[PDB]
C-alpha cells in the first residue's frame, strides 16, 4: 500500500526498497514549564552559652 506514512517505529521493519527516506510531523502535548500549587513548614526554641547556641 505504497500510499501512506507511519511512525519510524523500532517495532516495525524499515522499507527495503527506499533508503534513509523520512518525513517529520508535529505532535500534541509538548513538555512546558508551569506552576504547581502546594504547601510549607515551621520552627523551634533556644538556649545560650559562651560562643555556643543550643537548639531543641
Amino acid at each position: 500500500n505504497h500510499k501512506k506514512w507511519q511512525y519510524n517505529s523500532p517495532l516495525v521493519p524499515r522499507n527495503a526498497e527506499l533508503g534513509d527516506r523520512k518525513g517529520k510531523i508535529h505532535i500534541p502535548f509538548p513538555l512546558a514549564n508551569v506552576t504547581c500549587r502546594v504547601p510549607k513548614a515551621r520552627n523551634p526554641t533556644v538556649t545560650y552559652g559562651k560562643n555556643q547556641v543550643i537548639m531543641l
Binding site: 533556644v46 538556649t47 545560650y48 552559652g49 559562651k50 560562643n51 555556643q52 547556641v53
Partner: protein, 48 residues
C-alpha cells in the same frame, strides 16, 4: 532630636553589658547615663 529649652528627650539604646555606664553627646555637651540592664534570654545575641 529637636531641642526647645528647659525640657527632656527620650532615646533608645542597645548594649550587651549588665552594668552599662555610658556618655551621651547631645549637640556639643556630654551627659553620663547609669544603667542596670537585665537579661533577655541568655548570652548570644540575634542582631549585629
Amino acid at each position: 532630636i529637636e531641642v526647645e529649652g528647659n525640657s527632656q528627650l527620650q532615646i533608645s539604646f542597645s548594649t550587651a553589658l549588665a552594668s552599662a555606664e555610658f556618655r551621651v553627646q547631645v549637640c556639643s555637651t556630654q551627659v553620663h547615663c547609669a544603667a542596670e540592664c537585665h537579661p533577655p534570654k541568655d548570652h548570644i545575641v540575634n542582631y549585629p
